[PDB]
Amino acid sequence: SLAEIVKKDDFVLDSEYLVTLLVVVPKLNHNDWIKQYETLAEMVVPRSSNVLSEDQDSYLCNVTLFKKAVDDFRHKARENKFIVRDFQYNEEEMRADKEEMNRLSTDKK
Amino acid sequence: LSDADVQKQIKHMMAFIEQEANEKAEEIDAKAEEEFNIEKGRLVQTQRLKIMEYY
């Protein structure tokens, strides 16, 4: 669970007709990652899209798209050989999970 | 990549948003025509029925 891993700054406010999709995995297919993010879909934002984490063999990022471009972005990620990285922007849940973990460790102590 | 070409996809998305907004505005106008006529007709029917019954 990424939870704190994902960057909340890249989230799109008032994401009514626009959203941010996170589909990125292997770094072997990230050689043209800049262009892939800039034009993931037919109406993909080139500026907002950004990478939050970069593993030794894989990278994690969020790219902006239109509201109706969710499935299209998923298909484009699959074509680029990316893995499903649905997030749901559970920023509130992440804080709750961290608090629960803190209580459990304190409870254990 | 370049700003101009990327502006193409940006404008396509903006046109999608504007088309959704235009659909909403057309829905508002369709309301103001059909539902407005329905409400005015209901009010007219009620008022006329009451007035004619009293007459």
Add this chain to the structure above:
Amino acid sequence: QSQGIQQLLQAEKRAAEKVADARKRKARRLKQAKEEAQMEVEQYRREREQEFQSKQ
């Protein structure tokens, strides 16, 4: 960047404002049309009442 995001935030704000103003104007126009129809009906009823009284 921030400027590019704001250029579209303004567009989204305008999109919401257009719908809001449309709803407000629709309410105002509904009120005005109802008032006009009620006034016409009332004038017709008053004329009919006067005619009915004279005929009575």
